[PDB]
Amino acid sequence: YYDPLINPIVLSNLKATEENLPEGEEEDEWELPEDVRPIFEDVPLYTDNTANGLALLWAPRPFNLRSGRTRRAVDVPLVKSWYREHCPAGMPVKVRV
Amino acid sequence: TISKNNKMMAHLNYRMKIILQDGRTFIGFFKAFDKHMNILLAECEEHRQIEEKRILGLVLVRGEHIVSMTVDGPPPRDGGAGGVGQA
Amino acid sequence: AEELAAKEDEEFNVGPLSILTNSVKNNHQVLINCRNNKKLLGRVKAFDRHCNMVLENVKEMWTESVAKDRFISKMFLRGDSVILVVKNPLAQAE
Amino acid sequence: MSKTHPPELKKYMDKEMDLKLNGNRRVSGILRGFDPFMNMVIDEAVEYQKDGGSVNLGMTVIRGNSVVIMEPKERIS
Amino acid sequence: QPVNPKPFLNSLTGKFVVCKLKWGMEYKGVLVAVDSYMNLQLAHAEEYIDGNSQGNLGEILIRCNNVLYVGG
Amino acid sequence: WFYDHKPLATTRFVNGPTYRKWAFSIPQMSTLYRLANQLLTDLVDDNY
Amino acid sequence: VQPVNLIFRYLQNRTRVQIWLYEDVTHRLEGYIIGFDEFMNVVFDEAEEVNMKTKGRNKIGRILLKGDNITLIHAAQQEA
Amino acid sequence: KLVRFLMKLSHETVNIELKNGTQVSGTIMGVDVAMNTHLRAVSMTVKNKEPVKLDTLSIRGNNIRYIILPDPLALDTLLI
Amino acid sequence: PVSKKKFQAAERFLPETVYKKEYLADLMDCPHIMRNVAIAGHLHHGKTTFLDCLMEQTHPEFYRAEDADARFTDILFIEKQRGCSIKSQPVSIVAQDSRSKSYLLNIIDTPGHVNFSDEMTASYRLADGVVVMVDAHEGVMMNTERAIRHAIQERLAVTLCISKIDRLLLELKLPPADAYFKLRLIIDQVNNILSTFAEEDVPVLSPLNGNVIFSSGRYNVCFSLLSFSNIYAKQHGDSFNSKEFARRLWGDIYFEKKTRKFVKKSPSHDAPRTFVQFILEPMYKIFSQVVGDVDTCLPDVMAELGIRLSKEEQKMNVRPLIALICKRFFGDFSAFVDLVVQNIKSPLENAKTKIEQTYLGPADSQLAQEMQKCNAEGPLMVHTTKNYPVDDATQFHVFGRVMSGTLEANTDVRVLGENYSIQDEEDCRRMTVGRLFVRVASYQIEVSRVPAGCWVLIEGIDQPIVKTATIAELGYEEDVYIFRPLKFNTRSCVKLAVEPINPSELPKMLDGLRKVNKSYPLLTTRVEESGEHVLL
Amino acid sequence: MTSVGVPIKILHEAEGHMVTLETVTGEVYRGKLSEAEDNMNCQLAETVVTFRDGRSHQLDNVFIRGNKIRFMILPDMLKNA
Numbered sequence A: 001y002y003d004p005l006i007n008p009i010v011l012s013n014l015k016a017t018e019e020n021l022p023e024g025e026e027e028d029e030w031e032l033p034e035d036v037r038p039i040f041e042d043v044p045l046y047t048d049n050t051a052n053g054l055a056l057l058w059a060p061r062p063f064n065l066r067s068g069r070t071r072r073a074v075d076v077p078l079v080k081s082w083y084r085e086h087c088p089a090g091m092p093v094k095v096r097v
Numbered sequence B: 001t002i003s004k005n006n007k008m009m010a011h012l013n014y015r016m017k018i019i020l021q022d023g024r025t026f027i028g029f030f031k032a033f034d035k036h037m038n039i040l041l042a043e044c045e046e047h048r049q050i051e052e053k054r055i056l057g058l059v060l061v062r063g064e065h066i067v068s069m070t071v072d073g074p075p076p077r078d079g080g081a082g083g084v085g086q087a
Numbered sequence C: 001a002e003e004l005a006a007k008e009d010e011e012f013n014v015g016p017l018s019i020l021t022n023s024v025k026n027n028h029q030v031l032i033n034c035r036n037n038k039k040l041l042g043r044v045k046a047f048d049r050h051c052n053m054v055l056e057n058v059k060e061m062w063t064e065s066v067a068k069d070r071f072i073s074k075m076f077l078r079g080d081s082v083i084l085v086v087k088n089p090l091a092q093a094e
Numbered sequence D: 001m002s003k004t005h006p007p008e009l010k011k012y013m014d015k016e017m018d019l020k021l022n023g024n025r026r027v028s029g030i031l032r033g034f035d036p037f038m039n040m041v042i043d044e045a046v047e048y049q050k051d052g053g054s055v056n057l058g059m060t061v062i063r064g065n066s067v068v069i070m071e072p073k074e075r076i077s
Numbered sequence E: 001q002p003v004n005p006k007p008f009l010n011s012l013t014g015k016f017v018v019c020k021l022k023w024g025m026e027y028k029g030v031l032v033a034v035d036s037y038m039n040l041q042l043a044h045a046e047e048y049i050d051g052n053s054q055g056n057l058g059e060i061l062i063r064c065n066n067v068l069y070v071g072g
Numbered sequence F: 001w002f003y004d005h006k007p008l009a010t011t012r013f014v015n016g017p018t019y020r021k022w023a024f025s026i027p028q029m030s031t032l033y034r035l036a037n038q039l040l041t042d043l044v045d046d047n048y
Numbered sequence G: 001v002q003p004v005n006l007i008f009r010y011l012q013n014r015t016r017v018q019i020w021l022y023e024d025v026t027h028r029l030e031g032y033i034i035g036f037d038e039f040m041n042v043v044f045d046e047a048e049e050v051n052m053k054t055k056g057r058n059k060i061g062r063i064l065l066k067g068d069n070i071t072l073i074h075a076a077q078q079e080a
Numbered sequence H: 001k002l003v004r005f006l007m008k009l010s011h012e013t014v015n016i017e018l019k020n021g022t023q024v025s026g027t028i029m030g031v032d033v034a035m036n037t038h039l040r041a042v043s044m045t046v047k048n049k050e051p052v053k054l055d056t057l058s059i060r061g062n063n064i065r066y067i068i069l070p071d072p073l074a075l076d077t078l079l080i
Numbered sequence I: 001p002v003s004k005k006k007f008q009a010a011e012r013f014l015p016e017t018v019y020k021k022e023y024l025a026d027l028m029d030c031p032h033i034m035r036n037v038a039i040a041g042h043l044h045h046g047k048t049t050f051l052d053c054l055m056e057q058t059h060p061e062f063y064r065a066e067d068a069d070a071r072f073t074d075i076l077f078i079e080k081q082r083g084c085s086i087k088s089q090p091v092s093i094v095a096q097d098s099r100s101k102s103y104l105l106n107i108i109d110t111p112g113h114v115n116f117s118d119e120m121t122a123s124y125r126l127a128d129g130v131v132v133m134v135d136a137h138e139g140v141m142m143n144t145e146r147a148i149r150h151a152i153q154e155r156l157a158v159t160l161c162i163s164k165i166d167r168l169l170l171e172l173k174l175p176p177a178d179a180y181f182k183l184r185l186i187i188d189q190v191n192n193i194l195s196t197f198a199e200e201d202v203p204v205l206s207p208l209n210g211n212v213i214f215s216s217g218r219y220n221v222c223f224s225l226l227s228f229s230n231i232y233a234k235q236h237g238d239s240f241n242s243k244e245f246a247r248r249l250w251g252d253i254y255f256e257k258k259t260r261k262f263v264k265k266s267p268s269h270d271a272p273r274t275f276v277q278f279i280l281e282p283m284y285k286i287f288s289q290v291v292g293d294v295d296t297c298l299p300d301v302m303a304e305l306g307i308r309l310s311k312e313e314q315k316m317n318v319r320p321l322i323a324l325i326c327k328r329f330f331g332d333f334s335a336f337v338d339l340v341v342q343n344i345k346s347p348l349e350n351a352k353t354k355i356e357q358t359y360l361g362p363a364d365s366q367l368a369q370e371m372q373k374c375n376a377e378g379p380l381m382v383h384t385t386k387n388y389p390v391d392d393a394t395q396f397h398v399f400g401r402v403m404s405g406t407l408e409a410n411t412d413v414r415v416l417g418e419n420y421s422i423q424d425e426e427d428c429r430r431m432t433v434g435r436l437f438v439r440v441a442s443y444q445i446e447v448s449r450v451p452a453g454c455w456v457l458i459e460g461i462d463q464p465i466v467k468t469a470t471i472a473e474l475g476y477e478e479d480v481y482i483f484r485p486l487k488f489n490t491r492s493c494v495k496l497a498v499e500p501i502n503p504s505e506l507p508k509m510l511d512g513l514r515k516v517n518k519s520y521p522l523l524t525t526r527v528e529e530s531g532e533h534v535l536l
Numbered sequence J: 001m002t003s004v005g006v007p008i009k010i011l012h013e014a015e016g017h018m019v020t021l022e023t024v025t026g027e028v029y030r031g032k033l034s035e036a037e038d039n040m041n042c043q044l045a046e047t048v049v050t051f052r053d054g055r056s057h058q059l060d061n062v063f064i065r066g067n068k069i070r071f072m073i074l075p076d077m078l079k080n081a
């Protein structure tokens, strides 16, 4: 969907490129054979999983994976992202240190 | 021979003598063919009846003109793992 | 596959190839005029859209000129050389 | 039946072309049409005779398989 | 107005025709049948070479490729 | 299956009792991603 | 112009055309086209056979000239 | 179609005349859907030339004019 | 003793390639085939990763990680660590167009940072043609304009490649219709640059013009219109003339499924065009099925794509699985080979244009005609503008383009510095050529001779070559002139002064200055009248 | 393209180079194959025609119909391709 935070696709002064489409009279007769069809015609463009699957692509690791080798419980360092990123602005002396 | 895949892959690269409908004899290492029976001869030579030999390059013969072809000569020619023991 | 064979059989019952159809089933000799200016007189046992024929008890005659001939017990003739198939008036249904 | 891609000849269109045909006829003129069989259309066509004579033709259609060699008089466009 | 070959030969089918082969010989007879490939079957057919008849052949089949022209 | 000891180990989502490889779908991955949330960062990290 | 559309002009205009035969270099056919098919067989009308080695002529009338035998078809010159 | 009869004639001995007048005799080791015939233990008698013995010979099928078939051949069983 | 001087990757052996080296070396004798190209970009557009796809196709042994770009043409360890490209590197590869005719390509991966843009100048001197890489989200930023503009001024032939298209579907999530408009606007931006800066008839960059292609080097996607039409033609089986469909796959045109004709008025209020239906929606459906479903859809993806995935490939994640699905379905980049082959013109046609721009000498009778012929039998002339250092940094090899005659290893040659003229002539030396190599960034193929039109890496002549150099036949009795210096697209504005704590070591520092001066080209070394040693 | 046979693929790789082809009428044409087709129509440039009597002439461009070509001598590097 076109998220309104995405700025519109327009530049007001921009000259539109010439499109060398085929000229009508003979070329309009040209027809695509009756069984030629978009590669995924009837597969829907998106499902109710798709929104979640796209969100997972930029989940923090490990959640951007879906297949993985398994890891020991001692190795998952559950809080480690918290101290890597930064102190919150409000936390006092003890915690900052 | 040809098209029978187990057999065709062995009949390529033979040195074959090709007879054409104009009466020419070509000789070369036959190493590609086509459904139209076009043939591609590497290191080719021609013999013209009168006999005289001329050296050609890689020669593509359009299949329409072949009468017949025959084997002239063989393709060119040239376990391995162990080491457990000591002596 | 079999639809093309069915198509091939249907054309023989009506087309110009009826003469080959009659030659087989009534065993009537055809004097096939052929390229290289040679005549083959014999009975067709099978033929096709390409006008191949398998021939039995062939007499081959031609002008060399002087006449020469050869007897061929059985033959397959590639129909590309056939000019003109004459349902032979010098023979009859057998 | 078979499907054949249109020949490359579009770069030769409306340029002056010589042709050598079966039976060693020499034909010349402005090539301005072809088809997948290379049935040429030669406009303002001219015949060159094997005795050295020449005769103007009309707008001319040539059956493709009679064409042996075709040869521009001018650079390809 | 067009007179296309298959209508033309159908209009000749069952009628007398002259058939010329590509190699200097002519067969005149009743065109009994024609097919999509335009093989020709002639009946009561007679062989003409250099403008002269030289014999009745009866029913003859002329294979498609041999024909230069055929007509009434 | 969430609170089993070795979850899924006897199922097609993990190679077997040695418990060395896993391959979850998206319905599974998005659900546990959502449960994990309280521990996870907000970031599209690398530039921050 | 294509080729088939050009032969349609001979058909529609009934233009007197001269046909060159294939390997038969010493004969040409003159007449009017009255029809053709996808194989370029020509149903040919008022057809004459011209022996250019002598300029002798024979008149044949309406014929099917098989398209296999055609080298060239062109609008006839003023010769008759 | 009748070409599928010939490929049942594997290992039969035949005498072949080609369109060029070459006479070839030998045993069909195999012949294909285009009647390209592959022969073993082959003699080629090119026209007005002495016969030459050959081990193998592949003939492009359109060059075949006719194949003389062996006399015992059970035509009534192969033509089904 | 085993000093860990290693500052760049260098391959311990010649890696395997799909083409034979002998066919590459033979094709070098035939400039009527070969092309030279430079790839030029804003920082971190597709450019390096796209060449890794060309590497992966030709090589087979070329490992690309599922996590991160291999960036084969970014050989230096500073470039590995920084991950921007910092210096140009050349590739030479044999690659097939849509006809499966085999072309020889030489390609420089120019760095996208403007500070490095001096590297783009040296590359464009070699290039003949440029491919410009635009990022489907960012579009034409700063260096993209500078790359196009500077390529025009060189008189390169300019071609466009729109790159990281996947950003439209995955990150921006623009639908199909708006994704087409975003691509359309990028093309319009570039043509707006071309029409203002060219003033001459530099050719308009539509897809209908097929001088434009679309790519995602992360996902092995690269297609023009014709390669996508060939996919429909192969898939359905030549039921239509594929070039006639390709003409209709872009712009304001629509497919009327009632009639199967193509119409230019929107057949409904909502109708997707051609590009949206045929090109974009299958791409969105490839990604969205693997992104959303993976577990369930993947057998159906095998059926319509006819691709096979083994069960351990079906357990790949999304990025490697989509990249594998696209790799098998699209196959090689040949749409890009079409782009290069048709638009760029070879050495031979371009050699007239390139000698007029580069040469400085009297651009008329004797020597300039031998170069404009690009005749491999003519008198030797080589132009060089790069210096690459050997793995011990003891010496440089110079990188060169030949177009007169043939350059031969272990022969003697006349090397002309940037000042040489009939008055300056002391600025020339006779050098003995060492080995000659063809360079494929990390690895070098060694050859006895290189003929006009090729690029070459030359051993042993590096001592007098300060930056650019001309190399010329000794026996040529007529006047030889040097090719121009590099007319850089920027200036060295920042001055830095260098002084060692060690000053008895100052002679070692000056040798450091000479070596960097050779490596950089735009870096200017001064010794001021104050005695300061200065870098610019 | 569709999988046309190897001889036609080699013919398109021959487009860069000089080829020498003989026509069914006997004339030998040497020139630089500028376009070829899957029906093996050939366009030659910078051509020299050699007649069957041994006379020769230069020709700037030649188009030869594919079914009138007897054979072509291709260059050796194509054996590597």
Ligand SMILES: Nc1nc2c(ncn2[C@@H]2O[C@H](COP(=O)(O)OP(=O)(O)OP(=O)(O)O)[C@@H](O)[C@H]2O)c(=O)[nH]1
Pocket (backbone or CB within 6 Å): I041, I042, I043, I044, I045, I046, I047, I048, I049, I050, I069, I071, I083, I084, I085, I086, I110, I111, I112, I113, I163, I164, I165, I166, I167, I216, I217, I218, I219
């Ligand atoms: N999302 C997305 N990112 C990509 C894609 N291709 C490349 N990138 C990313 O962009 C960054 C730069 O890629 P490079 O190949 O190094 O780009 P680059 O332009 O060669 O870098 P420089 O030439 O030095 O400017 C890396 O993080 C890549 O992962 C893509 O197709 N999709």
